[PDB]
Amino acid sequence: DSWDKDVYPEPPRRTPAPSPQTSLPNPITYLTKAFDLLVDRPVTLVREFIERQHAKNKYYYYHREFRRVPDITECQEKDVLCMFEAEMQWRRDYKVDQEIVNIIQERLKACQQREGESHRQNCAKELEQFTQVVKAYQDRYHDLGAHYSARKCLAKQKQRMLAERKAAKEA
Amino acid sequence: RATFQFLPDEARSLPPPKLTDPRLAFVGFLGYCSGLIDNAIRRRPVLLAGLHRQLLYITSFVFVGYYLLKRQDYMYAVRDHDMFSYIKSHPEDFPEKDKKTYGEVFEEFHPVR
Numbered sequence A: 001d002s003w004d005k006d007v008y009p010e011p012p013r014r015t016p017a018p019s020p021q022t023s024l025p026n027p028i029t030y031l032t033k034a035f036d037l038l039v040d041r042p043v044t045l046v047r048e049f050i051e052r053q054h055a056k057n058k059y060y061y062y063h064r065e066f067r068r069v070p071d072i073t074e075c076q077e078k079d080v081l082c083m084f085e086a087e088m089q090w091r092r093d094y095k096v097d098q099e100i101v102n103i104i105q106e107r108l109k110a111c112q113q114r115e116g117e118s119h120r121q122n123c124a125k126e127l128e129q130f131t132q133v134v135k136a137y138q139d140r141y142h143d144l145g146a147h148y149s150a151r152k153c154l155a156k157q158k159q160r161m162l163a164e165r166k167a168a169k170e171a
Numbered sequence B: 001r002a003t004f005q006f007l008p009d010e011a012r013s014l015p016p017p018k019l020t021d022p023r024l025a026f027v028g029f030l031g032y033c034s035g036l037i038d039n040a041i042r043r044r045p046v047l048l049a050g051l052h053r054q055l056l057y058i059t060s061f062v063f064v065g066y067y068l069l070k071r072q073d074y075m076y077a078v079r080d081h082d083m084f085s086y087i088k089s090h091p092e093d094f095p096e097k098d099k100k101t102y103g104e105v106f107e108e109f110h111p112v113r
């Protein structure tokens, strides 16, 4: 349609059919018909005119593809030329991961509004997915500081890997 | 290398400073400023007075500056020639290291909590 329903899923809509139990006319029914006549139709035609001009001038833009380069683990110590590329790549991935957490947060918030008073039970998958991704993001990037770098990230991972190894040794 | 010589012969194997050298342009500018100050202290029209005098200020500065820049370049070439030849003469004092990657070198992590 406009976005991808996989990335931003919406459960199928279920609308109850009107069941008027009163003889009185419904004010919402006629205001809706007025809104379509007075607002929707003129606004729709104005848009179709604009969509005609765009179809006469069709041009394209692209999503940049970033080749993968060796990460900071493969860089010799103080080799700026290799460090620079690994460092820039790590920075790009840091921004992308930030937007991944935003997507999962957006799903979580959309579910909370959609489900209403039942959100507590009907948004368990969204909450679980959000909890896991925030754990992964925290492990990668939390506590690096303002002057974060791929090096500080790697040093934080190695420290974490060491702790996991020692506990495993206790087992 | 030659005793009490401003520009030894070996300095001729180096390329001379270009006449459009940015450093030389600055020196010429200093000569222009000196010419202006000369008019001002003597209470003459600063920009207009004595264009022959102002020309000679620019020319003398550029002339001297060209040779100073040439000796400057020569002395830095000599410094590197000496430094690299010494490294070659004493390999055991400048040994090539084995370069570890960051995946092997252990660096301690300091959290910013």
Ligand SMILES: CCCCCCCCCCCCCCCCCC(=O)OC[C@H](COP(=O)(O)OCCN)OC(=O)CCCCCCCCCCCCCCCCC
Residues within 6 Å of the ligand: B033, B036, B037, B040, B044, B045, B046, B047, B048
């Ligand atoms: C591409 C050029 C860029 C310019 C860079 C300037 C850098 C500073 C250069 C210092 C040398 C300036 C020339 C020496 C001063 C002589 C000027 C003077 O004494 O009075 C101004 C004079 C006009 O007054 P008058 O005495 O009546 O002479 C009539 C001529 N029209 O003559 C004039 O009409 C004006 C002459 C210039 C006035 C200079 C004013 C003083 C500037 C010093 C401030 C520090 C400079 C900025 C610091 C950063 C350097 C980039």
Ligand SMILES: CCCCCCCCCCCCCCCCCC(=O)OC[C@H](COP(=O)(O)OCCN)OC(=O)CCCCCCCCCCCCCCCCC
Residues within 6 Å of the ligand: B027, B030, B038, B052, B053, B054, B056, B057, B060, B061, B063, B064, B065, B068
């Ligand atoms: C380190 C990097 C930066 C480089 C720095 C370079 C600095 C060194 C360069 C030399 C600096 C001094 C240059 C002064 C230039 C102004 C000379 C001038 O215009 O003189 C005008 C006139 C006298 O000129 P005149 O003697 O007739 O020329 C023949 C010289 N044999 O009559 C006059 O009205 C002159 C009066 C104003 C001058 C002040 C008094 C000094 C007298 C100098 C006499 C002329 C010297 C000729 C300079 C030639 C230098 C190559």
Ligand SMILES: N=C(N)NC(=N)NCCc1ccc(I)c(Cl)c1
Residues within 6 Å of the ligand: B075, B076, B078, B079
């Ligand atoms: N520190 C001292 N007493 N002497 C001294 N300047 N040693 C430094 C050696 C040196 C530096 C620049 C150049 I150009 C050159 Cl040819 C030689």
